[model samples]
Target: QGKYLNRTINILNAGKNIAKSYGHNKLKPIHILSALAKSDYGSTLFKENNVNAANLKEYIDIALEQTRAGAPLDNKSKIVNSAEVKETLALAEAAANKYKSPKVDVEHLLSGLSNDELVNEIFNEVYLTDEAIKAILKRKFEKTL
Candidate 1:
């Protein structure tokens, strides 16, 4: 539980870093998904399920670019979580309980993304769904046991 919680915090920090690097002061769903796509657990689960994490990451970055809606911010500027981001975390926390997980991990976060409409909008464009993501997460969780 402690290990997973630490990894979750690292994932969030990575997402925040990505948003800041892209001059986005507000941490967006795309940034978090992009970060997750590269995470060890996230990537491994996607690969084990024969999913293309790289393609998803690329598509997410493309979507972020197409939006052309990021605000200008300095390197030192803080990246605040968006409302959707907050909701995603809340959903992830709930998912941890739903899955009987001791802590919110990358898989839970991935599952929680479905609860965020902003993330779902882009996912729809990429032909990804919450059901599919959750299924993969479930499979991975089962395999761990």
Candidate 2:
């Protein structure tokens, strides 16, 4: 559990740093996903499940490149600042403490990810509709807890 939490924290910090260095000041979901996909656990899950982490990362990479190529992602591009990331982390910590779970589950990660509207928009743009995602999540985490 400690290792998992530490890994997640590092992921968030890496995303924050990427955003900062790129002058975005807001850690987009793609950045975090990309960072995670580069991590040991993330890589394993992606490879084991055959998830298209690279595809997702590539899409974001293209978006980032275009932004730097002069046609930057629209001004409305959702951004999660450092404060937002910290708050989300705090929420995850609280949930872990409350649930007394062995490890922060996928649901917790999803909950943390849901903090940014931009992430949702990107998911939608990439065909991961809100309705579909919510249904999947409900099945995974639903209970009268």
Candidate 3:
């Protein structure tokens, strides 16, 4: 159930580290996004939307406050998914299957994001909302002869 691409893994790991090491209450999707903002393809996606991904961390000052959304810290601090994060992952898998893609890409994750205001403002303001991301994905498929 983990057919994610490599860079996508990096983003997840980075987010996990941020949450675990920084003593976050839950592993918010915001953490995943914080790392995605620094990713190669993710940054480019933001660039296409005219946002500066490099400075996104500073932009998410509100998310920095964070919440006890999902997951918990244990002895080894093994990562756990909040209901929202689980939903995001499930949605990503569905999108991949619906799109007939072999693996889940970052775009899938972006599109599957829940209605978290902290995440929404950045995507909505930049016009990279879920449908927008799906629009880009659809454009990449079903080419004309």
Candidate 4:
């Protein structure tokens, strides 16, 4: 999150809270997927692309069912990011640098989604990929000056 913008940060907080709501002690990439999909940018990125946020979330619940969730002994409200979460962030940061963006935007977050196993699996079920996301962005950029 070295270069993550406020929107991206808010997405994480929302994603983190999503994890808590699910009773997940660790913030997984799938959680972030939910985080990103429901945000202003992420919402349109999918639904407008022929898939609804529910498509990703539908698979998320199935995937999440395989894991266990419990309250952290240290703090009831505390939740920690999983290693894969960090990996996604690192990949997102890398994508931001590649795009020459000033900060890690939500688009960068979507770009970084494919690297993680859980989210990658979710992507497959929902038919979302980096190339598809680029296509979405390309359409948005092509029309502008």
RMSD of each: 2.5, 7.0, 3.7, 3.0
Candidate 4 lDDT tens digits, 1-145: 4577888999999888878877777888878887787788778767777776766767777766665375423335778888888888898888777656758878778777778877787787778776786775455444543
Worst 10 residues of 1 by lDDT: 66-75
Identify the candidate with maximal TM-score. 1
- Candidate 3 lDDT over residue span 1-145, tens digit each: 5599987788877877767655664567777877788789888877876676645656564565555444445437666666777777788788877887788888777766635567777677655667777786775445311
Query: Which digits, one per residue and each the tens of the lDDT, describe model 2 over residues 32-135?
Result: 75566577765564454444676756666665554332233444455465565665555555555455555554444545655656555555555655455455
Q: lDDT per residue, candidate 1, 30-118, as tens digits?
A: 77877877888767866765667667777777866765445545668877998888888888888877777777888888877867666
Give the candidates in order of TM-score, highest first. Answer: 1, 4, 3, 2
In order, what lDDT does every prediction score? 0.75, 0.56, 0.71, 0.76
- Candidate 1: count the clashes: 0
TM per candidate comes to 0.82, 0.55, 0.78, 0.80
Poorest 10 consecutive residues by lDDT, candidate 2: 66-75
